[PDB]
Amino acid sequence: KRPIRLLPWLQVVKIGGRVMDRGADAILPLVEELRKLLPEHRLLILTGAGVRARHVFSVGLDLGLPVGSLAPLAASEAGQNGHILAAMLASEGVSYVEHPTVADQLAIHLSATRAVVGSAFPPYHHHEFPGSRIPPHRADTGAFLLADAFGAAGLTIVENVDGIYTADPNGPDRGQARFLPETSATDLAKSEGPLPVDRALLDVMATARHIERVQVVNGLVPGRLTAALRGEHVGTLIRTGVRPA
Amino acid sequence: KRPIRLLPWLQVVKIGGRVMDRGADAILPLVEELRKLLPEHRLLILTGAGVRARHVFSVGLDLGLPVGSLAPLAASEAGQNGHILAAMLASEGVSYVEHPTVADQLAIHLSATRAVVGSAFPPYHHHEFPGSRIPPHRADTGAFLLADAFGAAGLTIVENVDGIYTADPNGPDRGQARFLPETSATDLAKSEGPLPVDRALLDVMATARHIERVQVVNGLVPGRLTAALRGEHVGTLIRTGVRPA
Amino acid sequence: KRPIRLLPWLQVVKIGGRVMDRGADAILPLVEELRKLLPEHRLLILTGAGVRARHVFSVGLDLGLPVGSLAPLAASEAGQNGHILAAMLASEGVSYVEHPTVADQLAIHLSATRAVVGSAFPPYHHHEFPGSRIPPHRADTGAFLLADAFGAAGLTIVENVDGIYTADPNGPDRGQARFLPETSATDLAKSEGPLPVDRALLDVMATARHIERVQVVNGLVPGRLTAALRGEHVGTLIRTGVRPA
Amino acid sequence: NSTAELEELLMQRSLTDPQLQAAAAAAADFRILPDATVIKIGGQSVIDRGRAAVYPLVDEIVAARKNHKLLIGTGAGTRARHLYSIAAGLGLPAGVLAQLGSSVADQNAAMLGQLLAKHGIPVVGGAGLSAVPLSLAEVNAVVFSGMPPYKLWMRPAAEGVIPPYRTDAGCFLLAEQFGCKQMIFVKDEDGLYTANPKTSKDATFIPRISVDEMKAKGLHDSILEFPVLDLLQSAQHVREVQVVNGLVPGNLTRALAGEHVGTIITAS
Amino acid sequence: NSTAELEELLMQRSLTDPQLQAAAAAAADFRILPDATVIKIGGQSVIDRGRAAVYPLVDEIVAARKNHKLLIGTGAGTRARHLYSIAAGLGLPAGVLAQLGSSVADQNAAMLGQLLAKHGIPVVGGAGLSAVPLSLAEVNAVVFSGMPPYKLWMRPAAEGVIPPYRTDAGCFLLAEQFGCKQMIFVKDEDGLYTANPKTSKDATFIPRISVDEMKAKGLHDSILEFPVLDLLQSAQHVREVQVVNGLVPGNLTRALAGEHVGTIITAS
Amino acid sequence: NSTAELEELLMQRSLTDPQLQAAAAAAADFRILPDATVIKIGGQSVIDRGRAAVYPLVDEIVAARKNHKLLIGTGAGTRARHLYSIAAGLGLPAGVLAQLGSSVADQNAAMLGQLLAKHGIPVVGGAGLSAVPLSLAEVNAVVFSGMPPYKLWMRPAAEGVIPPYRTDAGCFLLAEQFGCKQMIFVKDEDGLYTANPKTSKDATFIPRISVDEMKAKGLHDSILEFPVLDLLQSAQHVREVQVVNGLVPGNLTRALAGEHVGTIITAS
Ligand SMILES: Nc1ncnc2c1ncn2[C@@H]1O[C@H](COP(=O)(O)OP(=O)(O)OP(=O)(O)O)[C@@H](O)[C@H]1O
Ligand SMILES: Nc1ncnc2c1ncn2[C@@H]1O[C@H](COP(=O)(O)OP(=O)(O)OP(=O)(O)O)[C@@H](O)[C@H]1O
Ligand SMILES: Nc1ncnc2c1ncn2[C@@H]1O[C@H](COP(=O)(O)OP(=O)(O)OP(=O)(O)O)[C@@H](O)[C@H]1O
Ligand SMILES: Nc1ncnc2c1ncn2[C@@H]1O[C@H](COP(=O)(O)OP(=O)(O)OP(=O)(O)O)[C@@H](O)[C@H]1O
Ligand SMILES: Nc1ncnc2c1ncn2[C@@H]1O[C@H](COP(=O)(O)OP(=O)(O)OP(=O)(O)O)[C@@H](O)[C@H]1O
Ligand SMILES: Nc1ncnc2c1ncn2[C@@H]1O[C@H](COP(=O)(O)OP(=O)(O)OP(=O)(O)O)[C@@H](O)[C@H]1O
Ligand code: MOO
Ligand code: MOO
Ligand code: MOO
Ligand SMILES: [Mn+2]
Ligand SMILES: [Mn+2]
Ligand SMILES: [Mn+2]
Prior knowledge:
Distance between the termini of chain A: 8 Å
CATH class of chain D: Alpha Beta
Order of helices and strands of chain A: EHHEHHHEHEEHHEHE
Function (chains D, E, F): Intracellular storage of molybdenum. Binds polyoxomolybdates. Can bind at least 90 molybdenum atoms per protein molecule.
Order of helices and strands of chain D: HHEHEHHEHEHEEEEHHEHE
Largest interface: A-D, 60 and 56 residues
Number of strands of chain A: 7
CATH topology of chain D: Carbamate kinase
Number of domains of chain D: 1
Radius of gyration of chain D: 19 Å
Strand order of the largest sheet of chain D: 3-4-2-1-5-9-10-8
Family (chains D, E, F): Belongs to the UMP kinase family. Highly divergent.
Radius of gyration of chain A: 17 Å
CATH architecture of chain D: 3-Layer(aba) Sandwich
Bound molecules: adenosine-5'-triphosphate, molybdate ion, manganese (II) ion
Protein name (chains D, E, F): Molybdenum storage protein subunit beta
Strand order of the largest sheet of chain A: 3-2-1-4-6-7-5
Largest sheet of chain D: 8 strands, mixed
CATH superfamily of chain D: Acetylglutamate kinase-like
CATH architecture of chain A: 3-Layer(aba) Sandwich
Structural class of chain A: alpha/beta
Oligomer: heterohexamer
CATH class of chain A: Alpha Beta
Shape of chain D: globular
Structural class of chain D: alpha/beta
Number of domains of chain A: 1
Keywords (chains D, E, F): Cytoplasm, Metal-binding, Molybdenum, Storage protein
Subcellular location (chains D, E, F): Cytoplasm
Shape of chain A: globular
Helix content of chain D: 25-40%
Strand content of chain D: 15-25%
CATH topology of chain A: Carbamate kinase
């Protein structure tokens, strides 16, 4: 049978780096919403990287650096977003916790306080996989690997758009972009074209053991994160293909 | 007068590495018993090393390595047992904590949560004492040094046998092995022959300042650990020769 | 406008290294007073260095070492004082926490327990400023930088004298030393002559954003720390020149 | 293409955008340690065997580092299998087993490193660069633990909780990301056979084979972790690997000299 | 004065006592790394520009370390400015921004260090000595991140929340406290001008100037962090610095050879 | 005996079993750093004395490392005694004092190491191997803090809370476990006397003595931590130590050259 759930009562929330990139205008309402959620859920809040990782990719690729060099360079930006977000929640007892602490001591930290913040990137470092010159295991992927390894009650991905569309809704084909209320990871993996989530997220969903659904919701709309953590359908649901025991 | 007690309300429990070696059949009932004890006691749970340290001793000795090399190699196996045991208690808020954290931050960690797990080996590393080719300061010894330094309310040693016998009850002289309900460390130190506890444990008992009795109980019998933590006599009591103030 | 307060509910208490130097006669009553304050306040207790730093300055200066070498050598002594003080409060759930932990994880640690102890020295290390051969950013300075950066509710400096005098009250001009119940940092900075607080404390007070007053009180008189944390005037008040929003 | 066009895509598109992925693929290719060779010393196949296997390899490492820059990774072996068995029986997930396996590879690195210390060769951390550049320049070799640092973020296999990326994968990925010239796996068989030589009488030795040919013969999981074969097909810098028998005296030395001992597995 | 008299003051007086301060000032003066040069490679001015700027400087570093011991610190640049902007807009204080800026300088150190790794030059921690003595003795150079380690204890500026002590200050303080012989800032302009050359048509080049003269001309915050100018006036060991254009091929090499390229800024 | 018989006992018996203990005693004996000498520089006896004592020893270390591989450990001294006094008066246990003493030995290592840094000699961690193999191969010396890492697990003495295993024991144990060829304690007296030379008029110098003879003369706790004498009797590799006066110019140099300055204390 499947492995046990280590932290079955845990809710994992991944905050997009590009949400953080919007600054106070986006972060202050999200922090207020997170504050209200602290008494309702036990939260592991994981931040992605955003635009600064694109800059370091631009420099690193111009220098010729391999994908195992670019991966920790990008992960650093997710960590900086996590320190920023944690600083905003410090007065609620929330702090940033490092990867080794998340890996081995999360249980005690969530006993001390209602939420902690960490980096959503996984620590693949120079052991990132070759193939693409862009690190494949990024913030969505790391957050899901963690949530599923813990057997958490859910993973909610907080985006700067309503969810997944059939095309980039801020891109050249924006006009034909249709919103997808629900999809399966296997269907997404068959599609070509951009997504708001890592392609590697769909791969780790295929080998997942616990998380059956991940919702992508618009963190720029107050209340959607709160609704999503109660299972209300306010963004795109991704079925992982895990089925119940 | 004797040094103060740093953590007088602490109960220290040392889990034998060979108990862990039995796998789920032994570990699951022990984890269930530990879960029930979390609301009753403030627990520092320390794991020993077991059979994997014997393998690394076999390799290391074949390579000629000195006792200061073998000591951290064995300690690593106690740490792995601690990570395994902590993972099983994670949903109760229990995590593994590293040696420096145990040494300097145990008070805050036991304020955050009811129990933590650590390695029972002491960090003697390459400063292990010479003499024997087998590291003398092992899991029983480290657990006692810690319990007595903290001035803890007790140390209970959880074994794969009922207690100490006059001979190895799984050995060649098993037939003449008589169970010892109670003994003194000084008497044990005078005896030759194997024991279920480190010989160095008897030495550190002689210089102990607080712990007057250590009970060795069979962790393979559900309820003996619970009884022992209430001071009920269900295994072998070792009198350290500390006397009350 | 001014930066937000990260930990507005925090009280910071700096314990002079020379108070610690007096040993049990001074430390035991202070520990008893701190114990009684744990249920009243959320405390960050920061220890200074005291006489041992003077010894290492004597050796280091005799060896010709620059001020960036002497700064971490002195900071080590404040850390040792912090470990001593924390050990005395361990049975109350209090532990020493390292500088990186204070900088990034203080919120979660004060959620786990009522108080923590750290080093009052800032981690300037070999990046200490040149000019004086004596490290300028010492225990008072580090404690204030932290308290003001956090936006803490106060910083109280616990001394071996009643407060600031017009001359060293244990020095050659002791006879003309007049007690100063209240002063401003700018006035002190204009005075020449010794003070019981770092000269650099007055400099960081000039750029402070939150802390309006710091009281220096005699930790050798039981009850003055307790009174000072309630805002009662029992030592020297230093006005920083911050004004309310 | 151009740097400006790549930077534009990098700012404006998702990293998943195929157009962005294609422009990044045209970037220049820097090899960080192009003159170094990565060697994996097997845990079960070599170090677990003790003095008779390890001491001759120590002698070869010492002789080889005069003419060759070496990154020497260690396997895990029977103690990791014991830990995997305990943890798997408890229902623990692959991410938990990954950390347990890494401590066994660490133990093996420390034992090998202590035998090499008097020759100046240090044990260094495996996650990245650490003391590698300085040591490679001075003493021409370092020892590291071969387990990848994925810990709780280890990708699970399709079935079971055994971490699929273990010390073959760890050593291979470092060779690949440092752009090393050569990757040698040191095991306890002369190379790849058409069947497991320990449990097959009539297995035939294979001097050279591609990954695709291996898969077409059922040998996907044989002398190398099958995930390593897929990593090899995606590699930018290390497009073949060599598997040699470390129990044959001089086999490592001869492999470093360019002799075709063992089996050469090619990406294509 | 005497050691006994200094020790007496050290035991009996506050460290604030002017008599104690004066006796400590008479102590002998040991230079820890007197033969080394500290170089700062600008973040915005060099590393952010990519290959065209960085690769020639890598070549110069490699050539220079044959005759010169080098401590090479990195700046932060545009990613730090982005982080400062986000955090400042949230009301975060200078001590929080300081830690964010340090991670960008760390990124730049890692990128530069990976280009130098095959030449044996490591990336080392910047807070102090670390692997510096051994590396300087063997491979004659190290790379470090230039941000000072003040973190939440960063002194704020008089106005605003931008950390005033950034990577110019960090590199300068290490040169000063190690007693290095020379401090070279590598930026993207030939040196100091009477006005910002990027936004002024008629700026005039200044080959040599004192800190006091700079302040009398409004140039307190120009090509160097103004706090660095005050640190320089208080310095014991490094009483002048040189600012050179790293985009000019050979400029670093020529500066290390004693050529007066760029601007020499003197403490007095 | 045989490896199989030892492995059988190792699997089947308690480690306390005398038969297992005896078989392990027959194992081969590898010396990790057989050509190195461990030197302890006293805290109270040397470093606390400042320039007049330390600078000549720095010169000797620099001259000696051309012909000798050196591991240089530091003592703690008067600041540790102050900390022990404060903590003991509070009722704190030996395990707490042990950590306090280690920070003073660390301070002394940093001061000594900064005087040696321009000669390439680093300060390294004392718990084990760290940067020792690489540094010993290149610059022939390292500095480390001499306190053992036992921290809260320090064995207490029979009486009192002073840690019995301090920097003499720490340095000795590293010499023993690395299998070094020589262990030299550098103190402030010519060697062992029949009484404490600082408080006895008529003490007689002892050039050579065994541990047993020392105990029969009441000298168990004299110029060396008495626990070190018992460690020496149990040692496998270092069966004698030499105690020399570091205040005599050239005494360390001459001791390294094989001259019998000072006192040789033998295990038997
Ligand atoms: N099919 C799609 N559906 C929705 N958004 C898409 C799609 N394809 C591309 N996008 C783009 O992805 C953007 C989100 O960008 P991205 O996923 O890189 O940011 P992020 O998740 O905040 O960053 P990080 O991965 O660092 O956390 C959306 O604003 C949208 O423009
Ligand atoms: N006199 C004795 N009384 C009881 N058991 C003994 C005695 N002598 C030997 N033994 C053996 O010791 C075994 C326990 O082994 P051991 O003490 O090595 O394991 P452990 O405590 O689980 O391991 P670790 O020390 O790594 O925690 C018992 O099962 C028994 O066979
Ligand atoms: N103007 C002054 N007013 C009061 N005390 C003064 C003054 N000038 C000097 N002092 C001296 O300063 C002493 C306090 O010393 P100091 O400030 O060094 O100790 P501390 O604060 O305990 O140490 P640390 O800074 O390491 O925490 C007082 O006992 C007094 O003798
Ligand atoms: N077709 C095959 N050809 C050769 N060897 C095979 C084949 N199939 C299976 N094997 C077995 O695979 C083994 C190599 O894997 P093994 O795990 O022993 O190496 P390892 O690197 O020591 O692993 P670790 O280092 O993790 O312990 C060989 O000992 C061999 O018996
Ligand atoms: N009077 C002046 N003379 C020369 N340059 C000036 C002057 N005033 C302003 N500058 C500007 O200052 C810049 C140098 O500062 P800048 O922050 O770019 O360097 P940096 O070291 O790369 O910073 P970082 O490393 O933190 O990114 C020059 O590019 C120049 O445009
Ligand atoms: N019989 C004896 N012969 C020689 N010296 C003795 C004797 N008995 C006591 N001593 C004293 O022991 C001292 C050596 O111990 P001491 O603690 O000073 O050395 P240390 O290595 O500097 O200690 P630390 O390094 O921990 O400060 C000598 O200074 C000497 O005065
Ligand atoms: O990172 Mo922590 O381990 O808050 O107790
Ligand atoms: O290891 Mo921790 O220090 O749980 O806060
Ligand atoms: O130092 Mo800690 O981070 O008590 O959880
Ligand atoms: Mn996204
Ligand atoms: Mn036992
Ligand atoms: Mn003071």
